[PDB]
Design an enzyme around this catalytic site. Structure first.
Site, PDB file in Angstrom:
ATOM      1  CD  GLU A 212      -3.266  -0.485   0.854  1.00  0.00           C
ATOM      2  OE1 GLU A 212      -4.647  -0.600   1.134  1.00  0.00           O
ATOM      3  OE2 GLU A 212      -3.256  -0.128  -0.743  1.00  0.00           O
ATOM      4  CG  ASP A 221      -9.710   6.207  -1.298  1.00  0.00           C
ATOM      5  OD1 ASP A 221     -10.379   7.271  -1.904  1.00  0.00           O
ATOM      6  OD2 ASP A 221      -9.939   5.420  -0.930  1.00  0.00           O
TER       7      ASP A 221
END
Ligand SMILES: *SCCCOc1ccc(CCNC[C@H](O)c2ccc(O)c3[nH]c(=O)ccc23)cc1OC
Ligand SMILES: CC(C)CCC[C@@H](C)[C@H]1CC[C@H]2[C@@H]3CC=C4C[C@@H](O)CC[C@]4(C)[C@H]3CC[C@]12C
EC number: 3.2.1.17
Length: 442
Positions: A212, A221
């Site tokens: 991530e 995001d």
């Protein structure tokens, strides 16, 4: 051939240039830039200094001894040139041995990757190495103890044109064990435990840290919502002010936008517990999760952190084979998906983790682990360049006049090139890459 000596001379001249120019850049980058003034880099300067004296006082005079096939500098410099040659090797192996011990004490320390020795204390260690090197190399050569009893050796010491390193059986064992073998045994064993601790460090937090990516600032995001650290959703609201109110509520202090590595690890531990409970509450994910070990459990959580509980539940064919503990068969189903098409590098590591049940897929992927790999090559290069010479040197003690003079010189010369090898290996680190670019104007 006749003109071959001239041709070999140009090749040997470039080697001298590669050692000097290369090591000069290493010493300059550490001294000029404040950015690379670390405890380990102070030893790197000492290592580059030992390599620099080789290319200035050993390598140019050594190359000329083959071009004319005789010594044209005198008996005074012949003893001095040999004394520096052993000094530079003795200091380099000891410095690399010190780095191996320093990295072990920094990796085992509660304050990880931070050296226990201070700047002033590290400078003493550098001086301690050079003084011990001077006692073990300069003293047995200058204050004659290396001289052999046989007539064949005496003729070389007497001649002003001969500078061949003829050594007695007592010195040949002592100079190889003390100035090479003993520090090598410690360097190999201690640094093997450094790589063992790098494998010990491999956790669920470290897994998602590579996949991530840890981000200290508030970012939007792939979907559009506000996220911080490692896939931690703050709020679904499009207003940034709503995320700041939630961030302070999650930590317990005025953040203002930026958090820390330790606080990001704390937020991840809060999210990992919610992820596991989310899997257990899910009807399809729960029977599969119960048939997965600690390492393989983390690979399933890695998928939930990327797409969510509803997304992972969609892999009907993959989950059925994972529950049955069939790893190679489920690996094909996981590779044949949208998840692999969107994120190929991430899926390749996760699928391999499901296949073996080990963290071996994440070897030397972290910023800290790549730096340990870089230092490992420096130790590996010095071994593979000097060991073929030292392993052959012991055979001369066992059987007299077995190894040819051309073989002894060539194997010694492999270790001469090693002095110019290190600066090219230092280019691996991104911290040094920027330093060399700004200095050379690129
Ligand atoms: S100028 C003579 C013709 C060219 O051949 C050479 C002769 C001698 C040397 C220098 C000797 N090499 C030292 C060697 O690297 C070395 C280092 C360290 C230790 O501990 C050693 N111990 C030993 O017992 C023997 C050698 C050791 C170089 C020549 O090539 C240019
Ligand atoms: C010449 C023979 C006798 C041995 C020479 C050893 C020298 C090269 C060693 C011993 C002390 C070492 C220095 C110790 C302190 C510093 C200051 C630091 O900020 C950069 C490295 C630097 C500059 C080292 C460079 C290498 C060094 C100067």
């Amino acid at each position: 051939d006749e003109v071959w000596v001239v041709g070999m001379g140009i090749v040997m001249s470039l080697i001298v240039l590669a050692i000097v120019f290369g090591n000069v850049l290493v010493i300059t980058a550490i001294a000029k830039f404040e950015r690379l003034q670390t405890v380990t880099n102070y030893f790197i300067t000492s290592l580059a200094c030992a390599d620099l004296v080789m290319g200035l006082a050993v390598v140019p005079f050594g190359a000329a001894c083959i071009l004319m096939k005789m010594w044209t500098f005198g008996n005074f410099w012949c003893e001095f040139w040999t004394s520096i040659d052993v000094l530079c090797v003795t200091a380099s192996i000891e410095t690399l041995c010190v780095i191996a011990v320093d990295r072990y004490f920094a990796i085992t320390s509660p304050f990880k990757y931070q050296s226990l020795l201070t700047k002033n204390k590290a400078r003493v260690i550098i001086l301690m190495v050079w003084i011990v090197s001077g006692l073990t190399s300069f003293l047995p050569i200058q204050m004659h103890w290396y001289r052999a009893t046989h007539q064949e050796a005496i003729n070389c010491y007497a001649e002003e044109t001969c500078c061949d390193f003829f050594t007695n059986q007592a010195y040949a064992i002592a100079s190889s064990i003390v100035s090479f073998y003993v520090p090598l045994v410690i360097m190999v064993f201690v640094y093997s435990r450094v790589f063992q601790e790098a494998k010990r460090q491999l956790n669920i937090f470290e897994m998602l840290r590579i996949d991530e990516g840890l981000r200290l600032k508030i970012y939007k995001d792939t979907e559009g919502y506000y996220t911080i650290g490692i896939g931690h959703l703050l709020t679904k609201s499009p207003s940034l002010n709503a995320a700041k109110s939630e961030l302070d509520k999650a930590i317990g202090r005025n953040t203002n936008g930026v958090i820390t590595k330790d606080e990001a690890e704390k937020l991840f531990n809060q999210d990992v517990d919610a992820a596991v409970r989310g899997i257990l509450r899910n009807a399809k994910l729960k029977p599969v999760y119960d048939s997965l070990d600690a390492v393989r459990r983390a690979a399933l959580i890695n998928m939930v952190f990327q797409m969510g509980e509803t997304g992972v539940a969609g892999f009907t064919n993959s989950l059925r084979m994972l529950q049955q503990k069939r790893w190679d068969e489920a690996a094909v189903n996981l590779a044949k998906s949208r998840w692999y098409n969107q994120t190929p590098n991430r899926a390749k590591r996760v699928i391999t983790t499901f296949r073996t049940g080990t963290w071996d897929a994440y070897k030397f992927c972290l910023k800290e682990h790549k730096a340990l790999k870089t230092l490992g090559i420096i130790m590996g290069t010095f071994t593979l360049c000097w060991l073929p010479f030292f392993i052959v040197n012991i055979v001369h003690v066992i059987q007299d006049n077995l190894i040819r003079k051309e073989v002894y010189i060539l194997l010694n010369w492999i270790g001469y090139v090693n002095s110019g090898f290190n600066p090219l290996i230092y280019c691996r680190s991104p911290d040094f890459r920027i330093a060399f670019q700004e200095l050379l104007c690129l």
